[PDB]
Short mmCIF file of C-alpha atoms and ligand atoms in Angstrom, two decimals:
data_model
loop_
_atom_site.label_atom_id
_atom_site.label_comp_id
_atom_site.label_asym_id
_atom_site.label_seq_id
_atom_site.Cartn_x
_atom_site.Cartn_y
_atom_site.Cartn_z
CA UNK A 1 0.00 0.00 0.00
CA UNK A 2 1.21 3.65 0.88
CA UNK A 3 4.01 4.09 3.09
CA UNK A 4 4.20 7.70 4.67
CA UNK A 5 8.47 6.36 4.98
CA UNK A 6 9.14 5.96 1.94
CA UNK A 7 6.33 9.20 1.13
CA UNK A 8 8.47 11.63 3.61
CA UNK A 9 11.81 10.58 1.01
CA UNK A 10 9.84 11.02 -2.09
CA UNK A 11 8.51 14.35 -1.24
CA UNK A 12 12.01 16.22 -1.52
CA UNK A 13 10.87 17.43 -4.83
CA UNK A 14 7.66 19.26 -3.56
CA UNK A 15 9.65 21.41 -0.61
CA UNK A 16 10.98 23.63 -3.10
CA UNK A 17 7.71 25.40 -3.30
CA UNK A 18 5.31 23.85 -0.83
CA UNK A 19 5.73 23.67 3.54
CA UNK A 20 2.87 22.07 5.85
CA UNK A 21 3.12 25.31 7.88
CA UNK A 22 3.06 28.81 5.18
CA UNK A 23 2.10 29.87 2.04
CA UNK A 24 5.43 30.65 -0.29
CA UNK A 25 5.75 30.04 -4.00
CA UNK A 26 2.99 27.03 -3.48
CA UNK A 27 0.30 27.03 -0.71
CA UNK A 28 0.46 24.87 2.52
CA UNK A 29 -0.55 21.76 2.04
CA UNK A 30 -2.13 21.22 6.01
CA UNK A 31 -5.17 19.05 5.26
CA UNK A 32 -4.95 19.15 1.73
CA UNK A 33 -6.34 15.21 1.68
CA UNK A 34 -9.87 15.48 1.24
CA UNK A 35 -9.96 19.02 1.03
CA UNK A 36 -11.53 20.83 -1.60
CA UNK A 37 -8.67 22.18 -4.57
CA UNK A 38 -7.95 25.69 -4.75
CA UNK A 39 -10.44 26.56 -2.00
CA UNK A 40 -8.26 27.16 0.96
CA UNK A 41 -4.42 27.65 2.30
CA UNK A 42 -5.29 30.14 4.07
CA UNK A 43 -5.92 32.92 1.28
CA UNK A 44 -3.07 31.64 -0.95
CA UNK A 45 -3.74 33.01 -4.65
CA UNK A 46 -4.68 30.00 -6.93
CA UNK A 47 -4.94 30.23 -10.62
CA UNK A 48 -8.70 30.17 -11.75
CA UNK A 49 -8.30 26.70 -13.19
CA UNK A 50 -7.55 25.24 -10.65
CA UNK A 51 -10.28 27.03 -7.97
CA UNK A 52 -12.81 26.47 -10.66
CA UNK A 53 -11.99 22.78 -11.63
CA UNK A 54 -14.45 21.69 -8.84
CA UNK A 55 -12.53 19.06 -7.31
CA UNK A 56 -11.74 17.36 -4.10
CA UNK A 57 -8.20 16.18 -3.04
CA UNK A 58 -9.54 12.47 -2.59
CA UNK A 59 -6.70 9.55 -3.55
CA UNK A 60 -7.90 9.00 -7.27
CA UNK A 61 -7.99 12.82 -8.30
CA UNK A 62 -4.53 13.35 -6.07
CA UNK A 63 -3.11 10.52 -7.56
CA UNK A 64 -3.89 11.56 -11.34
CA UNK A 65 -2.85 15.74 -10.24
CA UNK A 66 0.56 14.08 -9.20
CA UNK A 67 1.16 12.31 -12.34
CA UNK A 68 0.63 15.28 -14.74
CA UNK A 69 -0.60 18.26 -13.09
CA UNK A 70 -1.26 20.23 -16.36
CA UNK A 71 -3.12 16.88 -17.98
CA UNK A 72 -5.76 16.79 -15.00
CA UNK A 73 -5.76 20.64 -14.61
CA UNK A 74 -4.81 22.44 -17.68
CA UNK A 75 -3.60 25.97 -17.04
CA UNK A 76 -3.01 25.35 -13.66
CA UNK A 77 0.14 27.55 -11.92
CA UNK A 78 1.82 24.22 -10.34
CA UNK A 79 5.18 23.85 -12.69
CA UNK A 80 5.96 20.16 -12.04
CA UNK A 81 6.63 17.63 -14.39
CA UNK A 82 4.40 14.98 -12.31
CA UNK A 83 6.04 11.87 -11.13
CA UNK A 84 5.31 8.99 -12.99
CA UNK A 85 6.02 6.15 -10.36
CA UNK A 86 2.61 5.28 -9.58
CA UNK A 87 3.71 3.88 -6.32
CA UNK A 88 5.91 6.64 -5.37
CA UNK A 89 2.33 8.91 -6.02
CA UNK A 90 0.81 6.51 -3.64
CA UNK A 91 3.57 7.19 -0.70
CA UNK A 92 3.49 10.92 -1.43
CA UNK A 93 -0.40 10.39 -0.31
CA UNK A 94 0.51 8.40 2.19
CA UNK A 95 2.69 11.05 3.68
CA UNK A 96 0.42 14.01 3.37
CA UNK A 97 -2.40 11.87 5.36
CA UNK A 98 -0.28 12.52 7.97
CA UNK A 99 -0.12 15.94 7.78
C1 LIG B 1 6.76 24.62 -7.56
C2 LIG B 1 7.58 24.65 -8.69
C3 LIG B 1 5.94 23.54 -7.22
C4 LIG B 1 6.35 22.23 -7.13
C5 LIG B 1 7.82 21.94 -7.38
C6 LIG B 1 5.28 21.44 -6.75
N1 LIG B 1 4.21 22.28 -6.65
FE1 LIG B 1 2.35 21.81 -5.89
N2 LIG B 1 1.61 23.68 -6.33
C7 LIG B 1 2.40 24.68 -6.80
C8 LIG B 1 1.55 25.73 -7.10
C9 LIG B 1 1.81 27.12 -7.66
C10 LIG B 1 0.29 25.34 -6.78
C11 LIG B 1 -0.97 26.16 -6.99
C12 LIG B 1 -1.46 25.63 -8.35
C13 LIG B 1 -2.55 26.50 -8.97
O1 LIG B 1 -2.91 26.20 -10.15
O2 LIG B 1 -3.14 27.40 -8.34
C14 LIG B 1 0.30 24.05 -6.32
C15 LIG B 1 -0.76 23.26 -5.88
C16 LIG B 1 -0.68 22.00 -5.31
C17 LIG B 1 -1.69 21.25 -4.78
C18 LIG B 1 -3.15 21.65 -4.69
C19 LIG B 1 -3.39 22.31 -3.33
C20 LIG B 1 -4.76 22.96 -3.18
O3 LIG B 1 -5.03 23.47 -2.05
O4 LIG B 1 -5.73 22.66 -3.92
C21 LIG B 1 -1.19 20.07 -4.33
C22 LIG B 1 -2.10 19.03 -3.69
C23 LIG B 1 0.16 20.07 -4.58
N3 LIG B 1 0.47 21.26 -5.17
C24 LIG B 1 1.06 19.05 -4.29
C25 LIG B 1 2.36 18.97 -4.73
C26 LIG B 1 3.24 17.96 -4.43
C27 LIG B 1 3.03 16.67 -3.67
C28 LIG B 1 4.41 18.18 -5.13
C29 LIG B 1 5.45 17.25 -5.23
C30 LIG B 1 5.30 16.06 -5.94
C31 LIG B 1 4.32 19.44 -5.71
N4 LIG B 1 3.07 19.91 -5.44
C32 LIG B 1 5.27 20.07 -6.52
C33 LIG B 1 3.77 24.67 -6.95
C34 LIG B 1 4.59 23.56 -6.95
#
């Protein structure tokens, strides 16, 4: 399954522009799991495709967002290749459950 271990590792990428505590070139991702996308962060400025694509952070959309952000939300203002280790999406999710 998803192991928040090997997710904490895998996540080096992501700290470049996101933190689980402040908003800097990405938004905080505190509770992002479930949460609804481009919503909250307290305040942080998302593009409007992302705030209107209507979706919730649940595994299957966070899973296909990791992969390709631009595929599953074209002209969003995340710059990030995706990853395209399936499991290493899964222990990403895994480790922002526990945040
Ligand atoms: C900077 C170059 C970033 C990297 C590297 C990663 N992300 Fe990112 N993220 C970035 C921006 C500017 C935004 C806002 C996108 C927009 O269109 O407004 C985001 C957004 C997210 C989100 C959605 C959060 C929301 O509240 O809806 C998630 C869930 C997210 N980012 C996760 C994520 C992870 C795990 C990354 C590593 C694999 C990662 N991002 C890379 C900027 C950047």
């Amino acid at each position: 399954e998803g192991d928040a271990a090997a997710g904490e590792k895998a996540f080096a990428p992501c700290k470049a522009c996101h933190n689980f505590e402040k908003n800097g070139v990405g938004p905080t991702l505190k509770g992002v799991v479930g949460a609804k996308a481009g919503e909250g962060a307290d305040g942080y400025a998302f593009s409007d495709a992302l705030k209107k694509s209507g979706l919730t952070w649940d595994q299957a959309d966070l899973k296909q967002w990791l992969a390709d952000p631009k595929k599953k939300v074209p002209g969003t203002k995340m710059v990030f290749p995706g990853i395209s280790d399936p499991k290493k999406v899964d222990d990403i999710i895994a480790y922002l459950k526990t945040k």
